[PDB]
Design a binder for these strands. Structure first.
Lengths: 122, 239, 51, 370
RNA sequence: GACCUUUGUACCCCAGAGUGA
């Protein structure tokens, strides 16, 4: 029935958009459910961001099944326009993937976002 | 192609030799595929009358995709799951392990699968239509008293559920549905319990509260080649 | 006859085994299909014709 | 205390009387004795479900702390003890939540659940087979298996879009049927190639040729008129029938008896059966292709849809995956990947999302030209 | 007493899991 769970609140959404902004600054970001599915195959994916205003929505339902197979966190965001904007990118991106790097300059922000997401998934 | 296959020390798990150390089991489903695994066909047929030629395929078992094959390749002393027993399985994430546990429990043995996330459950209903030994029972794990009629008494319980609070979950299942002197095997993901602290104190209090519920641990181990920051613990009930 | 007909046995016994191959082929196909509705039958009755 | 608890299973609803438990405490004599004996408990009464529809509906009720009415009827047994509520009976069960329900419909009855994992309740289920007093056991654990199928299958599945393998069986059985058509077709064209060596060089069709050998059996009577066989399937004014008049005169083949021909009538009837089931099954594949994957048959039609899902094995398995022609084929790959994920999820693929998707394929189809 | 390989014919003319303004 809901099909839009979990959907994030306000300050977590802008927090995620800022983390995606520095992630696009550090080329540690994947753009597209095609690419995101490939990163879920290679096991390099930290977590997955999906949009809620994508028409249709059922093209994006494969990512929770593949993530729950791989035990990977995921949270919906309401805008695909702002989700495109946080990529340093001027046309919308429906879904983005966070890649794995322990040498990442922004790693603590990624662990805090995974703390909020993994808090919300339970 | 050209490999040879021997019976290992554990009953029900078969070793494959030898241009890679490979771990295989017998498939009771002819020519099925669960995740694009590759199958090795080796037979002891007969060209004589009265006996038709056998067709036997074996399935490899990725230790990256399951925790138990990673457990066996890492070295582990005994396995409580053998031909003949009953086994209660927790965690149902993709059903990939459930095929191999269904292989190792034999056609005598019964596999009991538990999940609450309703969308992967239909896959296991389909595999239940494929393999006639995988019995799904779909419910929240936290209330096993809600399906008191729905399962028998079990020799051994395996838990692969990542929670912050799995200790009460195996407490209720262990107090309810387990036989005397059975086996309890628990999987642990490190950061699921806590992440603000070392994993090792989490291991100590994990074995501690595990020991408060009348469970004797035998040996734990760390899986450094295969799945980093992850450990499995093997113990007895009322030993 | 003009040919001294004996070749038709050689044809027919070449056809009979392929007929049984189609027989257990389509019988197992029917078992694969009908197993959805009623799987518990093949362990009890195993013959194709009675199936 | 005043104890008289209830054993619950798929196996019959049973009321058992107790003598006394151990008010003695948790040591390693009483637990290890009561693990395996387990006398001090006797079977008073019981009642079967014996409805495969009945048991599951009851199982949701006990699974949600809700009583059934046969449970009230089996809790109508205290009469030779001269009363209820002089008893102040204490029940002990497995559920917390069922307690306040029984206390609601019974003020006569004290009802607790302490202890929740009271080991006497383990003492029933660790020795249950021996208390099958008049009860079967053979299909009883089979009712355990299938009733577990009934619960887990019941709560999430309603046979919604079942054709994840039926389409694959249809295309595989169909293709092996066509290979089996060419099998008998070569044998019939060899056979009538003996008796009449020219019609095999005339009609290239298989089923047409099979009916021709089927209903004639004589190379001096096969014409459009006297008798009429090219006035029913084909018309006599065709360019074939004049060559049939041409061929029925100048034949020099072997003249064979009827006994050799009746076996060939069996062969032509086999060809007729094969053509029958392949046309009907082809129609069925059109129907369920229109049903279970509508947007895919909007895009690429029936055949490549059935073949590609026949590669992946299910629409879920196709769903989880990902010289100036491969731009078009790549575009079709992406949009068919999208349409598959549409068709996977519940009856919004009944709409025309794939139709405007094919309109986008028409737009890209305009785009490669310019 | 004790099915395997070669010649000729038809078809296919070979981006998917590639890369990522």
């Amino acid at each position: 029935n809901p099909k839009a769970f979990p959907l994030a609140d306000a300050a977590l959404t802008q927090q995620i958009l800022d983390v995606v902004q520095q992630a696009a600054n550090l080329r540690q970001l994947k753009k597209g459910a095609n690419e995101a599915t490939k990163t879920l195959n290679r096991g390099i994916s930290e977590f997955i961001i999906m949009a809620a205003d994508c028409e249709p929505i059922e093209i994006l339902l494969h990512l929770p099944l593949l993530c729950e197979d791989k035990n990977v966190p995921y949270v919906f965001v309401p805008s695909r326009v702002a989700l495109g904007r946080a990529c340093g990118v001027s046309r919308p991106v429906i879904a983005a993937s966070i890649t794995t790097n322990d040498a990442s300059a922004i790693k603590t922000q990624i662990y805090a976002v995974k703390d909020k997401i993994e808090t919300l998934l339970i | 192609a050209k490999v040879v296959i021997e019976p290992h020390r554990h009953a029900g798990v078969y070793i494959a030799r030898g241009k890679e150390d490979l771990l295989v089991t017998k498939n009771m489903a002819p020519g099925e595929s669960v995740y694009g695994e590759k199958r090795i066909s080796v037979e002891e047929p007969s060209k004589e009358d009265g006996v038709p030629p056998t067709k036997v395929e074996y399935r490899v078992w990725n230790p990256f995709r399951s925790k138990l094959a990673a457990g066996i390749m890492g070295g582990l002393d005994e396995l409580f799951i053998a031909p003949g027993k009953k086994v209660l399985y927790l965690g149902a994430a993709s059903g990939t392990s459930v095929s191999h546990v269904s292989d190792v429990v034999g056609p005598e043995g019964v596999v009991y699968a538990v999940e609450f996330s309703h969308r992967p459950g239909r896959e296991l209903i389909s595999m239940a239509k494929k393999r006639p030994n995988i019995i799904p029972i779909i419910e929240d794990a936290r209330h096993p008293q809600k399906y008191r009629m729905l399962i028998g008494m079990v020799d051994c319980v395996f838990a692969d559920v990542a929670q912050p609070d799995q200790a009460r979950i195996i407490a209720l299942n262990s107090h309810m549905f387990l036989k005397d002197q059975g086996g309890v095997v628990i999987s642990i993901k490190a950061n699921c319990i806590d992440s603000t602290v070392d994993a090792e104190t989490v291991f100590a209090r994990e074995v501690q509260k595990l020991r408060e519920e009348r469970i004797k641990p035998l040996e734990q181990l760390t899986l450094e080649p295969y799945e980093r920051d992850h450990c499995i613990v093997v113990g007895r009930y009322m030993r | 006859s003009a040919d001294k007909v004996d070749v038709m046995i050689i044809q027919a016994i070449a056809l009979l085994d392929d007929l049984d191959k189609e027989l257990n082929t389509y019988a197992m196909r029917c078992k694969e299909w009908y197993g959805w509705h009623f799987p518990e039958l093949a362990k009890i009755v195993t013959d194709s014709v009675a199936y | 205390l005043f104890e008289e608890p209830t054993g619950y299973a798929v196996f019959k609803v049973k009321l058992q009387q107790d003598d006394i438990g151990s008010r003695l405490k948790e040591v390693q004599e009483q637990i290890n004795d009561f693990g395996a004996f387990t006398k001090l408990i006797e079977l008073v009464s019981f009642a079967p479900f014996k409805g495969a529809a009945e048991a599951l509906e009851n199982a949701n009720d006990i699974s949600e702390g809700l009583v059934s009415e046969s449970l009230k009827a089996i809790l109508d047994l205290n009469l030779p003890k001269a009363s209820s509520k002089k008893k102040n009976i204490t029940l002990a069960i497995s559920d917390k939540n069922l307690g306040p329900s029984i206390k609601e419909e019974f003020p006569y009855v004290d009802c607790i659940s302490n202890e929740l994992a009271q080991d006497l309740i383990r003492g029933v289920r660790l020795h249950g087979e021996k208390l099958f007093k008049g009860l079967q056991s053979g299909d009883l654990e089979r009712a355990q298996l299938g009733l577990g199928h009934a619960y887990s299958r019941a709560k999430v599945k309603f046979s919604v879009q079942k054709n994840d393998n039926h389409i694959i069986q249809a295309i595989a059985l169909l293709d092996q049927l066509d290979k089996d058509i060419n099998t008998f077709a070569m044998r019939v064209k060899e056979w009538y190639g003996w008796h009449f060596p020219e019609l095999a060089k005339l009609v290239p069709d298989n089923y047409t040729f099979a009916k021709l050998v089927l209903f004639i059996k004589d190379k001096a009577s096969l014409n459009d008129d006297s008798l009429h066989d090219l006035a029913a399937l084909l018309n006599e004014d065709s360019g074939i029938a004049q060559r049939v008049i041409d061929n029925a005169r100048i034949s020099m083949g072997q003249d064979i008896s009827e006994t050799d021909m009746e076996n060939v009538c069996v062969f032509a009837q086999r060809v007729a059966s094969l053509a029958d089931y392949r046309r009907q099954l082809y129609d069925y594949l059109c129907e369920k292709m229109h049903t279970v994957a509508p947007n895919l048959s909007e895009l690429i039609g029936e055949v490549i849809g059935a073949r590609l899902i026949s590669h992946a094995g299910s629409l879920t398995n196709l769903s989880k995956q990902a010289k100036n022609k491969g731009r078009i084929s790549r575009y079709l790959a992406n949009k068919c990947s999208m349409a598959s994920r549409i068709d996977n999820y519940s009856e919004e693929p009944s709409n025309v999302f794939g139709s405007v998707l094919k309109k986008q394929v028409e737009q890209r189809l305009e785009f490669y030209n310019t």
